[PDB]
Amino acid sequence: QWALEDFEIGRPLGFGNVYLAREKQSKFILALKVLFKAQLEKAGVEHQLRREVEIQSHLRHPNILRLYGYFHDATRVYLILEYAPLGTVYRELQKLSKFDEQRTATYITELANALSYCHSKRVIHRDIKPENLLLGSAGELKIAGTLDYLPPEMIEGRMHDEKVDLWSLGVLCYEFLVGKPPFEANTYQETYKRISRVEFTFPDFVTEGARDLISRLLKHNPSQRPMLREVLEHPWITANSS
Ligand SMILES: O=C(O)c1ccc(Nc2ncc3c(n2)-c2ccc(Cl)cc2C(c2c(F)cccc2F)=NC3)cc1
């Protein structure tokens, strides 16, 4: 059982705010997520958070952000999270516009690993996107509305499985190389039609090796999408990863 008295709150990092924090006894640096019990009870997704924390703190992977613990105060609910010093992949993306193939392949590899571990633990993520991707001190990737990353089977409300994260991995591979998601539009409506029709095009600079992998991942039929092992063994990933 923790308390707010154990932590020294630092700079803001972000239904509330995420702060830099230092545990007093150990001097351990962490991110402390602050959420108000008012918004959580007004949305009723406190059970969704009860289950989410049950899952997040039970998993151990170098590419999944760690949740150490949690606790609630008078009106707040606190999440003791890992701290990823180099920030979000979303900030890196807009600070560099696009990623080269070697950076893309490594992230994709680290993702495929983190997902293959999740899929072996019967967990399907559904929602990877740059703003949910964080960077550790070594620069390694870490996994912590808008339709851009959702598969056709999901937005159409059909039954879905592990192949959902394969679609997302395709969308992320495209975005890394291009700077924008393959189905981006100015409205939720247009984006919906573009995803369901699976209509995307490649800019000239995108190599055929990348085009192939993305085109394999972005199949409408979930069954035709490669397994994560095939992703990690793709010639384009092979040639460019770390
Ligand atoms: O720009 C900088 O200087 C910067 C920014 C971030 C970090 N590192 C860091 N480390 C851990 C966390 C966060 N950020 C963080 C920060 C803010 C918010 Cl709104 C959410 C989180 C999250 C998060 C989460 F809970 C769900 C989904 C995605 C998340 F990103 N998780 C803890 C370092 C430097």
Side-chain angles (χ1 to χ4, degrees), residues 2-14 16-24 26-36 38-40 43-45 49 53 57 59-72 74-90 92-94 96-120 123-158 160-189 191-192 194-207 209-228 230-242:
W2 296 97
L4 223 195
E5 66 186 317
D6 303 321
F7 303 96
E8 295 181 330
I9 298 170
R11 70 173 270 249
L13 302 170
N17 288 341
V18 174
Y19 297 96
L20 220 207
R22 182 174 73 162
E23 205 288 317
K24 279 171 185 169
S26 53
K27 291 172 176 183
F28 194 87
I29 281 293
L30 55 95
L32 186 76
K33 186 159 186 161
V34 182
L35 297 161
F36 284 81
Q39 292 99 59
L40 297 156
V45 295
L49 197 78
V53 173
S57 60
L59 290 169
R60 305 283 181 279
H61 199 274
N63 294 142
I64 300 169
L65 200 79
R66 192 91 166 273
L67 197 160
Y68 298 111
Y70 77 107
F71 65 104
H72 40 75
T75 190
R76 324 94 166 126
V77 171
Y78 301 104
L79 268 59
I80 308 159
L81 292 163
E82 207 192 307
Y83 166 70
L86 267 49
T88 69
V89 178
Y90 177 77
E92 191 88 301
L93 191 50
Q94 53 170 329
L96 300 174
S97 292
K98 310 181 273 289
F99 298 156
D100 62 42
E101 296 179 288
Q102 13 294 330
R103 181 181 278 255
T104 301
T106 307
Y107 288 160
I108 295 305
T109 306
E110 297 182 81
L111 265 169
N113 286 342
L115 288 175
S116 186
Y117 168 80
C118 286
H119 291 148
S120 64
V123 173
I124 56 163
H125 194 285
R126 309 166 190 205
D127 187 39
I128 54 168
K129 49 180 181 181
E131 46 266 286
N132 281 12
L133 308 168
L134 300 180
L135 298 161
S137 68
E140 70 274 55
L141 199 107
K142 279 166 183 290
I143 301 175
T146 189
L147 300 173
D148 277 291
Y149 308 86
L150 300 177
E153 67 257 32
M154 204 148 158
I155 61 154
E156 285 162 359
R158 305 142 141 192
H160 61 90
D161 48 12
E162 285 90 343
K163 310 303 289 172
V164 156
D165 290 308
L166 277 295
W167 176 276
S168 295
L169 194 60
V171 179
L172 262 173
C173 191
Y174 186 102
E175 187 168 10
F176 285 167
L177 294 160
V178 178
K180 276 163 168 164
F183 304 108
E184 186 174 63
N186 285 313
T187 80
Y188 181 103
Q189 288 80 357
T191 313
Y192 188 99
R194 286 196 74 194
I195 299 163
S196 62
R197 291 164 169 35
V198 189
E199 46 203 33
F200 63 94
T201 58
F202 295 100
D204 280 3
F205 59 77
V206 181
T207 67
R211 284 165 190 252
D212 179 70
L213 168 63
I214 295 162
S215 300
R216 285 176 192 276
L217 289 165
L218 289 180
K219 283 279 198 292
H220 179 269
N221 183 239
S223 316
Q224 288 180 23
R225 294 168 204 162
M227 318 178 298
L228 289 157
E230 301 173 37
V231 172
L232 297 152
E233 287 172 336
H234 196 271
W236 188 83
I237 294 298
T238 299
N240 298 293
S241 191
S242 302

